[PDB]
């Protein structure tokens, strides 16, 4: 068989600088080597074939080179829309339907502090017996952030979940969603619901809060 090895698994390049991705084949494949780009939630898209020929509608800042066993994808003046996973695929030796594990390109942009928003549970949810309180960190960078749930100043532990978007295609930031979940009964036992956010872009931790029965 012919194995594709891709290096590194992750690359962090600043906007407008040059990204260099490596594909190596366990044996020579001449120039029968294709590159694919797969953006979050999308299928792969063919980038390069013949090692160095750009597909239809592929911007000029993408270029591939190499032959034999060492191949390179180069992305010049990296754009925010270039955040994706990149795959190589040889088709010199039958069969062609194998891809390397892929290299993820992440964009290393400037620091961006998050905007912090809080949402109280809805009357609809509360009537059914549950209270979900949601805290929102919008359009920050880098990805690391600390979200602290406090209830009547008691730091909350073990009753919340969060998820993070992929790096945004337009401005290369992340947004983060943290849901605190309580029973109606526990919810109605306390007054102040707050989330506390610490991020590299914040000169001090930020707090958004509300009092139950205020909204």
């Amino acid at each position: 068989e012919i194995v594709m090895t891709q290096s590194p698994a992750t690359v962090s390049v600043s906007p407008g600088e040059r990204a260099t991705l490596s594909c190596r084949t366990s044996q020579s494949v001449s120039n029968k080597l294709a590159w694919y780009q797969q953006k979050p939630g999308q299928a792969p898209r063919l980038l390069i074939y013949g090692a160095s020929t750009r597909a239809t509608g592929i911007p000029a800042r993408f270029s591939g080179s190499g032959s034999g066993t060492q191949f390179t994808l180069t992305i010049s003046s990296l754009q925010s829309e270039d955040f994706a996973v990149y795959y190589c695929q040889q088709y010199n030796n039958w069969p062609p339907w194998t891809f390397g594990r892929g290299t993820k390109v992440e964009i290393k942009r400037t620091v961006a502090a998050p905007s912090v928003f809080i949402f109280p549970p809805s009357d609809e949810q509360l009537k059914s017996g549950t209270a979900s309180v949601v805290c929102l960190l919008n359009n920050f960078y880098p990805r690391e952030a600390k979200v602290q749930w406090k209830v009547d100043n008691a730091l909350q532990s073990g009753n919340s979940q969060e998820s993070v978007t992929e790096q945004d295609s337009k401005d290369s930031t992340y947004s983060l969603s943290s849901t605190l979940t309580l029973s109606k009964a526990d919810y109605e036992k306390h007054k102040v619901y707050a989330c506390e956010v610490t991020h590299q872009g914040l000169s001090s931790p930020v707090t958004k809060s509300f009092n139950r029965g205020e909204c």
């Binding site: 029968k32 294709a34 694919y36 999308q42 299928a43 792969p44 898209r45 063919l46 074939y49 597909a55 795959y87 695929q89 040889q90 088709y91 010199n92 030796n93 039958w94 069969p95 062609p96 339907w97 194998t98 891809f99 390397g100 594990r101 892929g102 905007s115 912090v116 928003f117 809080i118 949402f119 109280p120 549970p121 809805s122 609809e124 949810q125 059914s128 979900s132 949601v134 929102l136 919008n138 979940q161 969060e162 998820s163 993070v164 978007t165 945004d168 947004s175 969603s177 849901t179 958004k208 809060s209 509300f210 205020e214 909204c215």
Partner: protein, 232 residues
């Protein structure tokens, strides 16, 4: 403009069957081999099977993990092909793609290689014995507590559904700017839950209708929830 689209993914029980379809528009699918791939768990695409062109005998080949369970058929007159999946296993859970081999080269010995220049958007297949369950949709109400500098955030909480996926749009798709739909998280209940948010001008909360359109196909759940400002 040439395109492919997969259809037919959803929830299926272990041991049961499911048929996926691959539909071509703008070109003659019969000119091409239809190659099926699948992708799970953030790994690279994985070969599932292929059916060759009628010209090459219209025959099929399959990955070792599916041989004997899956089968590929094609109808050139309708520019469509199918992936028939029998005796499904939990490990078959994946996003399935169909592709066209627009790039081909040959020597005297036959085909040497292909590149896959068109892919469909994918269709998710979930094999589980757990039963389907539609989501609850709760508003994330905008308030002084979700407004920053003349910008307000609002959204929808799509809670406790199974399986993936749910889709979310805003005002039937007319509102796209500033939208963040988050990846679903799997709760300890085994049910999924996600949030969709959008930021808008504070000045519009009193006049502009914001409706989130939630669709959960496995459960035939469509919800169009209007999100109402709070006054705190």
């Amino acid at each position: 403009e040439e395109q492919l689209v997969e259809s037919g993914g959803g929830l299926v029980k272990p041991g049961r069957s499911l048929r996926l379809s691959c539909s071509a528009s703008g070109f003659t699918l019969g000119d091409y081999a239809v190659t099926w791939f699948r992708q799970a768990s953030g790994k690279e695409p994985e070969w599932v099977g292929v059916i060759r062109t009628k010209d090459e005998g219209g025959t099929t080949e399959y990955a070792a993990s599916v041989k004997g369970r899956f089968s590929i058929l094609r109808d050139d007159s309708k520019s469509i092909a199918h992936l028939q999946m029998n005796s499904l296993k939990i490990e078959d859970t994946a996003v399935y793609y169909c592709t066209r081999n627009g790039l081909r080269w040959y020597d005297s010995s036959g085909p040497r290689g292909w590149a896959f220049d068109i892919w469909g958007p994918g269709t998710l297949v979930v094999v589980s014995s757990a039963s389907t369950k539609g989501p609850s949709v709760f508003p994330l109400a905008p308030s002084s507590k979700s407004t920053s500098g003349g910008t307000a955030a609002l959204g929808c909480l799509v809670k406790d559904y199974f399986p993936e996926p749910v889709t979310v749009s805003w005002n039937s798709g007319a509102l796209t700017s500033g939208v963040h739909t988050f990846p679903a998280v799997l709760q300890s209940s085994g049910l999924y839950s996600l949030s969709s948010v959008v930021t808008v001008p504070s000045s519009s909360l009193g006049t502009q209708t914001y409706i989130c359109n939630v669709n959960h196909k496995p459960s035939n759940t469509k919800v169009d929830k209007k999100v109402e400002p709070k006054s705190c």
